Scaffold this active site. Sequence first.
Site, PDB file in Angstrom:
ATOM      1  N   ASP A  35       6.475  70.467  38.533  1.00  0.00           N
ATOM      2  CA  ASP A  35       6.164  68.989  38.628  1.00  0.00           C
ATOM      3  C   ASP A  35       7.185  68.354  39.734  1.00  0.00           C
ATOM      4  O   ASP A  35       8.265  67.827  39.066  1.00  0.00           O
ATOM      5  CB  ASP A  35       5.838  68.252  37.403  1.00  0.00           C
ATOM      6  N   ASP A 225       3.996  65.581  45.782  1.00  0.00           N
ATOM      7  CA  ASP A 225       3.841  65.798  44.057  1.00  0.00           C
ATOM      8  C   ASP A 225       2.822  66.918  43.876  1.00  0.00           C
ATOM      9  O   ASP A 225       1.926  66.812  43.907  1.00  0.00           O
ATOM     10  CB  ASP A 225       3.414  64.508  43.587  1.00  0.00           C
TER      11      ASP A 225
HETATM   12  C1  LIG Z   1       1.362  62.118  38.684  1.00  0.00           C
HETATM   13  N1  LIG Z   1       1.939  62.722  37.581  1.00  0.00           N
HETATM   14  C2  LIG Z   1       1.693  62.637  36.218  1.00  0.00           C
HETATM   15  O1  LIG Z   1       1.053  61.688  35.903  1.00  0.00           O
HETATM   16  C3  LIG Z   1       2.439  63.785  35.526  1.00  0.00           C
HETATM   17  C4  LIG Z   1       3.657  63.071  34.422  1.00  0.00           C
HETATM   18  C5  LIG Z   1       3.248  61.791  33.757  1.00  0.00           C
HETATM   19  C6  LIG Z   1       4.339  61.446  32.927  1.00  0.00           C
HETATM   20  C7  LIG Z   1       5.405  61.953  32.664  1.00  0.00           C
HETATM   21  C8  LIG Z   1       5.639  63.280  33.552  1.00  0.00           C
HETATM   22  C9  LIG Z   1       4.830  63.523  34.284  1.00  0.00           C
HETATM   23  C10 LIG Z   1       1.322  64.530  34.834  1.00  0.00           C
HETATM   24  C11 LIG Z   1       1.990  65.921  34.332  1.00  0.00           C
HETATM   25  C12 LIG Z   1       1.047  67.075  33.755  1.00  0.00           C
HETATM   26  C13 LIG Z   1       0.027  67.241  34.787  1.00  0.00           C
HETATM   27  C14 LIG Z   1      -0.664  65.780  34.990  1.00  0.00           C
HETATM   28  C15 LIG Z   1      -1.462  65.234  33.910  1.00  0.00           C
HETATM   29  C16 LIG Z   1      -0.283  64.886  32.681  1.00  0.00           C
HETATM   30  C17 LIG Z   1       0.386  66.108  32.291  1.00  0.00           C
HETATM   31  C18 LIG Z   1       0.551  63.912  33.693  1.00  0.00           C
HETATM   32  C19 LIG Z   1       0.380  64.892  35.647  1.00  0.00           C
HETATM   33  N2  LIG Z   1       3.187  64.346  36.480  1.00  0.00           N
HETATM   34  C20 LIG Z   1       2.812  63.966  37.615  1.00  0.00           C
HETATM   35  N3  LIG Z   1       3.242  64.355  38.974  1.00  0.00           N
END
Ligand SMILES: CN1C(=O)[C@@](c2ccccc2)([C@]23C[C@H]4C[C@H](C[C@H](C4)C2)C3)N=C1N
Length: 370
Positions: A35, A225
């Site tokens: 991520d 991202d």
């Molecule tokens: C946009 N995004 C998210 O909302 C997520 C996130 C949210 C909150 C804290 C850390 C990361 C996430 C990571 C993973 C995959 C996807 C759904 C969910 C679980 C949130 C994006 N990572 C990205 N890049």
Amino acid sequence: SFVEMVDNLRGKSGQGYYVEMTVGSPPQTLNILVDTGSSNFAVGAAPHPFLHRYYQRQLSSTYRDLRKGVYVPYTQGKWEGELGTDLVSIPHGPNVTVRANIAAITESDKFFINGSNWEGILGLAYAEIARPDDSLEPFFDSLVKQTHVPNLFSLQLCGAGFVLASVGGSMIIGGIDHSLYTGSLWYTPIRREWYYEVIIVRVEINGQDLKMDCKEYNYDKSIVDSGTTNLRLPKKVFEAAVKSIKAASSTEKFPDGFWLGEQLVCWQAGTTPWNIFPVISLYLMGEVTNQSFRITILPQQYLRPCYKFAISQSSTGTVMGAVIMEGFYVVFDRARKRIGFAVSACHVHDEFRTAAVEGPFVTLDCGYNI
Ligand SMILES: CN1C(=O)[C@@](c2ccccc2)([C@]23C[C@H]4C[C@H](C[C@H](C4)C2)C3)N=C1N
């Protein structure tokens, strides 16, 4: 050798890309989503209906409690955890082991994904956006500091190409694998070190300039991202983009539920009229002021598999997610505060068009201050 990192990424279409990691002693095996849109190393550490494995701190002789909770609410959901450190490795990555911060997720809402096959996430962005604050050193910072691994990583996300479809890819940590891309690498400056923020200076659909004040492309920011599936565009840019795409594919139209990324559209066995959908070129600010370069993506990228429209609206700026990264080899050159794009060795294309990275393109203030 980077060869041992090739194809170290797996995932299900739309459910992100994960790399295998081990945490603690003995090594607890876990699949961890890559991520670039967050900065916390956060792993399931308690039972969950969507989790078949999780980090068990008590089973780890090398676990160290930080006696500090962390609460991470976000738009779509949230997760809560307990801070600590432990030994972390990436079996198909650098042959090193580092003591990294780990957020042990004990409770969460709409965070984990059913059938995704990953049990945690690897926030690869900068400390500025780390939780609870910027003092919690991100994984990659720890990796670079504790090892001789160069301050740089690169992602080749390949997608599927011809049960939710399986995707593959590679995360090359500490360098660039030249077999992973063809042509030249073009660099756009990282505007600021929090997200991987960049500047888009021009956008074209089938060669047609959207003719918008470039500030609109980066309102209020543009980021790369890997944790986002879609290409996400600010409201004003999204509408202008969809309008242009609707027109180009006018010949036989679709339900607006499709354009909204809701409904899917189906042909059968290679009858998909790809040619009807236009290409999209994002021009990114070059390393030299009035220079830029473009990345051009095909319908094969923004229509993800029966297909869904993988371009959606954003109220938090442009998000260049998986579907835009899948065409290219993306170099996150943190050491030089820049991001390189090059045509990927695995990108999907027909016999009339191909994803492209082309520069330079000159201009005669696109950032959205903060
Ligand atoms: C946009 N995004 C998210 O909302 C997520 C996130 C949210 C909150 C804290 C850390 C990361 C996430 C990571 C993973 C995959 C996807 C759904 C969910 C679980 C949130 C994006 N990572 C990205 N890049």
